[PDB]
Amino acid sequence: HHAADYVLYKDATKPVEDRVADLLGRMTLAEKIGQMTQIERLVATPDVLRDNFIGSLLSGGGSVPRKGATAKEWQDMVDGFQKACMSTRLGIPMIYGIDAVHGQNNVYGATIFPHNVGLGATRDPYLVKRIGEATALEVRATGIQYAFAPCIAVCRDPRWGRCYESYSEDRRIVQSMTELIPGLQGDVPKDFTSGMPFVAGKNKVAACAKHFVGDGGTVDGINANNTIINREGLMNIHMPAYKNAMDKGVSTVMISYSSWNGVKMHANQDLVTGYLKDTLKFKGFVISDWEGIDRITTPAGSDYSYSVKASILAGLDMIMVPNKYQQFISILTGHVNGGVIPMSRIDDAVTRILRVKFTMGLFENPYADPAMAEQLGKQEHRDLAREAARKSLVLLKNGKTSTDAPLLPLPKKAPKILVAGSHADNLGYQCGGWTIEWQGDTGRTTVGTTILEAVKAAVDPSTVVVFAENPDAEFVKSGGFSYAIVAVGEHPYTETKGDNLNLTIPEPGLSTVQAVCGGVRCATVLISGRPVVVQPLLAASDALVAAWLPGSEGQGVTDALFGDFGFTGRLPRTWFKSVDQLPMNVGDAHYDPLFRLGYGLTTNAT
Ligand SMILES: *[C@@H]1O[C@H](CO)[C@@H](O)[C@H](O)[C@H]1NC(C)=O
Ligand SMILES: *[C@@H]1O[C@H](CO)[C@@H](O)[C@H](O)[C@H]1NC(C)=O
Ligand SMILES: *[C@@H]1O[C@H](CO)[C@@H](O)[C@H](O)[C@H]1NC(C)=O
Ligand SMILES: OC[C@H]1O[C@@H](O)[C@H](F)[C@@H](O)[C@@H]1O
C-alpha cells in the first residue's frame, strides 16, 4: 500500500496481526532476543540499547533520573532511550515500565493514592477505575507507557509484607477491583475477545496483572515463599481475578517469585503455558519479576544457564533482567543455537511483545507528549485521591461505652486542640512503601498534606491547633485541650522487609495514645498496611480509625473526622485477635475475629 520503500509493519492502517507477522519475518535472532530483554535504566546507554536491540526498559523502585526531577526531566530521559532504540535497523520502539501502583509513585510531585488494602475498604470499583484513569495520565506525564499494576494478589495472611498491595482477603473484592485495568488502559470495545491485550492510545498505559499466581497464599505470609494449597483452592481463591483481567484486556502478566506446592512459578510450564496461555487464551506478554529467573535456583543465580532455559521453556516472554543483559542475551542465544530452545518459542515471545506494542500505538507515538507534563499532581487528581482516602477509612470505635456521647464527628470550633503522634505530621509515613523510594521513606518526601496540615486547613480560625509529637501525660492534662487527634502506626515497608510475625506497632505509638487519651478525649488514627494488634490502642481510645496508608491527601482523613462526610469504609480483611490465630480467614472453622470482614461503624455528615 503505496511508496517504493513501503514496509507493511510501519503502515499504521494495517491490522496489528499483519504488522506483527510482517516485522517478525524480517528479524534476526539477535533482534528477536533483544525484544525479550528488559533492562534497568541504570545500565542503559544509547549504544547498549542499539547494539543489543533492547526491547524494554524499566525503573525499579527509586530508579529516577534525579531526586526531585520534573515531569519534563522524565520525558527527556525516556525520549533519549527511545531515540536510541528507534535508530536500530528495524526501528522497533522500546516500552518503558514502572511501578505506578498507587499513582505515579516514584515521581516527585505525583498524586499518591491510597494503597490497595484501603481501596478494598471502599467497595467502590468505579472509584478504582477513576484512580486508574488518573494514574495513566500521570504516568504519561512522565513519558512512560507501562505500569506494573494491578497487584491482584489475595492476601490470606497479614504477616505478609505485601498485604497492603492486596485489595482484600476475599477474592470477590479483588475481582471487583480489576476495574483498575480499563481505567489504566481504556475500556475494551464491545466485540472484544477475552485474553487479547488492549490499550486505547497515547493517553493510556499498558497494565500488568501481577503476580501470577498465589503470591498472597504463601506459608506464614513469608514473601516469595511456597504456597501449599490444592488446585481446587488455587483456582477458587488465587486465580479468579486473572480471568477478570483477561476479560478486560490486560496487556501483560508478571510472574511471582513464589512457588506453588514447591514448583517455582518462574519455571512452571503447566501454569504459565498450560493454563494462562492455552486455557485462559492470554495473547499479551508474560514478564518475569526482577531477577525472578535467577531465583529459580537455590542459591539464586547459581545456574543462570538453567534459569534461562527453565523460564523461557515455561512460557515467559520478556525477562526483567534487569542488569546483566549481556549474559542473558549470550545464554539464550547459545540455547537457541544448540536446539535446546526451539525457534517456535522465541517467535511466540516476540509475537506477543510486538502484539502489545502495536496494539497500544507505540509505533505511532513512540515519543513523549510535552503537553501532558502538567498532568502530574493535578488538583482534580488530588481531589480524587482525597475522596478515596476518606472512603477507605474504617471506623472501629466511636465511644468507650455505649452510653458516651459519640466523639466523632469532632467540632471545627474549639478553643484549643492537640494533634499528636509519630504519624500526625509525616507525609512519608502516611504514604507507606513504594513512595519515592522502593521502601518508602520518612518525612516530607513529596508534595502533599499531612494530618496536621489537614487539621489546620479544616478548623475554625479561632481554633488554636497545638502539635506535639510525643507529649507526656502532664503536658496533655495541663494543656487546656478540648480533644486530641493522635496518629500512630507502621513505618513504610515493601516486599520481604515488611514480613512481620508479631504485627505490633513500633513504639512510641501505644505509649503516646495512652498519654494523650488519659488526659483528654481522643480520636486515634491508626496508619498501617494491614490489621495489627489493636486491643491496647482500642482500650485507651474514645474513637479509633483504621486509615490504612491513605497517601498524599491527608484532608481525606479530616474530611471524615470533622464530619464533612460520614464514615463508610468496611474492613476488607479480617481483624485478628492474636497473631497465633493466623492464618484466619472469613470462612475457616476456628473463625474467631476481633472484627469480622465487612465490619465498620458509620457516622452521618454535619
Ligand atoms: C521458604 O522460606 C524458608 C525459610 O526461610 C526457606 O528455607 C525456603 O527455601 C523457602 N521456600 C521457598 C519455596 O521459597
Ligand atoms: C515483631 O517483628 C518486627 C518486624 O519483622 C520486628 O522489627 C519487631 O521488633 C518485632 N516486635 C517485637 C515486639 O518483638
Ligand atoms: C445517621 O442517619 C441514619 C440514617 O437515617 C440514622 O438512622 C442514624 O441513626 C443516624 N445517626 C446519628 C448519630 O445521627
Ligand atoms: O531488591 C532490589 C530491587 O528490587 C525491586 O523489586 C525494586 F523495584 C528495585 O528498585 C530494588 O532496588
Ligand 4 and 554: CB distance under 6 A: no
Which class for 50: exposed (0-12), middle (13-18), buried (19 or more C-beta within 10 A)?
middle
Ligand 2 and 496: CB distance under 6 A: no
Which class for 262: exposed (0-12), middle (13-18), buried (19 or more C-beta within 10 A)?
exposed
Q: Distance between CA 487 and CA 244 in Å, rounded? A: 37
> What is the three-class DSSP state of 115?
coil
Here the cell at position 420 is: 499528636
Here the cell at position 479 is: 494543656
Q: Distance between CA 227 and CA 212 in Å, rounded? A: 12
Phi, psi of 119 (to 5 degrees): -65, -40
Q: How far is the CA of 224 from the centre of ligand 1 (A)?
A: 8
What is the CATH code of the structural domain delimited by 1-60+81-96+295-361? 3.20.20.300
If phi > 0 it is left, if psi is from -120 to 50 it is alpha, else beta; for residue 140 that is alpha
Here the cell at position 493 is: 515497608
Q: Three-class SS string for 99-111?
A: CCCCCCCCCCCCC
- HSE of 398, CA atoms in CB hemisphere, 13 A: 20
Ligand 1 and 225: CB distance under 6 A: yes
> What is the three-class DSSP state of 210?
strand
- The residue whose C-alpha atom lies closest to atom 4 belonging to ligand 1 is 225
- Give the DSSP letter of residue 45: -
Ligand nearest to the CA of 406: 3
Q: How far is the CA of 532 from the centre of ligand 3 (A)?
A: 30
> What is the three-class DSSP state of 525?
strand
Q: DSSP letters of 253-276? A: EEEPS-EETTEEGGG-HIIIIIII
CB 111 within 8 A of CB 385: yes
Q: Distance between CA 114 and CA 394 in Å, rounded? A: 13
Q: Please choose from 225, 228, 296 the residue to mutate so as to test ligand 1's pocket, defined by most ligand atoms within 8 A of CB.
A: 225
CB 146 within 8 A of CB 206: yes
Q: Distance between CA 62 and CA 56 in Å, rounded? A: 18
What is the CATH code of the structural domain delimited by 379-581? 3.40.50.1700
Sign of CA dihedral 212, 100, 574, 568: negative
Task: Please compute Rg for the chain using Cα positions.
Answer: 25
Q: How far is the CA of 288 from the centre of ligand 4 (A)?
A: 13
Q: Distance between CA 268 and CA 504 in Å, rounded? A: 36
Here the cell at position 535 is: 486491643
Q: Please choose from 222, 291, 499 the residue to mutate so as to test ligand 1's pocket, defined by most ligand atoms within 8 A of CB.
A: 222
> What is the three-class DSSP state of 38?
strand
Which class for 584: exposed (0-12), middle (13-18), buried (19 or more C-beta within 10 A)?
buried
Resolution of the structure in the document, Å: 2.0
Residues serving a catalytic function are 289, 495
In the block, residue with C-alpha cell 539464586: 300
- The residue whose C-alpha atom lies closest to atom 12 belonging to ligand 4 is 61
Ligand 2 and 504: CB distance under 6 A: yes
- Give the DSSP letter of residue 373: G
Kindly list the domain boundaries of the chain, sorted by start residue. Answer: 1-60+81-96+295-361, 379-581
Ligand 1 and 365: CB distance under 6 A: no
CB 276 within 8 A of CB 240: no
- Give the DSSP letter of residue 183: H
Which class for 340: exposed (0-12), middle (13-18), buried (19 or more C-beta within 10 A)?
middle
